[PDB]
Design a protein around this ligand. Sequence first.
Ligand code: FE
Ligand code: K
Length: 329
Amino acid sequence: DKTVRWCAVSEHEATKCQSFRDHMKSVIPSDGPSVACVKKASYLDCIRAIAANEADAVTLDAGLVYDAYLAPNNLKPVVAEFYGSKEDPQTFYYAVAVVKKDSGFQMNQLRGKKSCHTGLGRSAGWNIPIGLLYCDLPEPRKPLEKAVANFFSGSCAPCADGTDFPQLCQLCPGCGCSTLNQYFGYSGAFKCLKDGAGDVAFVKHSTIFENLANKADRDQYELLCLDNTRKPVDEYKDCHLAQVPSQTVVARSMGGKEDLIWELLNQAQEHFGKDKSKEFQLFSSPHGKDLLFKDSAHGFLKVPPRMDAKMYLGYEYVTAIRNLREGTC
Ligand SMILES: [Fe+3]
Ligand SMILES: [K+]
């Protein structure tokens, strides 16, 4: 069924990708789908490679899915991750603002604080929180990256340009756009908070649970609610910034191999999905968290025929992004 060229960002994902192909080949017949690995330094290089027919697939946060749909790449979502459980799949997750207990500040008091973001342009780590704080930012609010840098007193916004927006990398010099940057992604943003570099981490509802197994340790953290109060990390359903579409695998519109990508991932989730194998796991890895796919995912769902990013993401989230990039006060 031909080979799907998967795009791995940096060495940790490259390692997991190699294991993915090795294990798939050990259980799949010469008739079944196979995986090949193409390593890039950033998800941006992956989008380029896919559009240039140098790679076939890569999983992207919904905010990035939107970006990849823009010309001249025009990539489309083909397979979505789903969370929660297989019995009740969730094609969305909650964006939350995690902070340390007794730090003494609410959402409307974030000015002058230090921020840890999953990455520039990502849903929970950027689009949602910055979209909500837009008008609190000092003018001129454009370019947004600089206004955010001026609002906080130091941040870590992976993938941001450290030359033009130096303070956005104050918490993670260089703003590396891969796991090479220890403060990249959900768990990286959380570590940025835990280590004490930042005062707040913009991540998802499962992030703290993925990093602190004991409740006693989680009790030292809280969430900032939109009504300017704080609640326990377990109460995210009643204290989140917003809900966002799940991260999805994108591919080319023409000769994109979406049928094979699904065939590969569908069989893969049966062989190496949650609790399926003692040899390999699609949703976890001894090499790191959220490599290739999010650890919080429980499986995959095929995206409807020919659906583009805008339609897939939904009018609400698309509007959120457009209002962030446009909008006034
Ligand atoms: Fe995300
Ligand atoms: K500042």
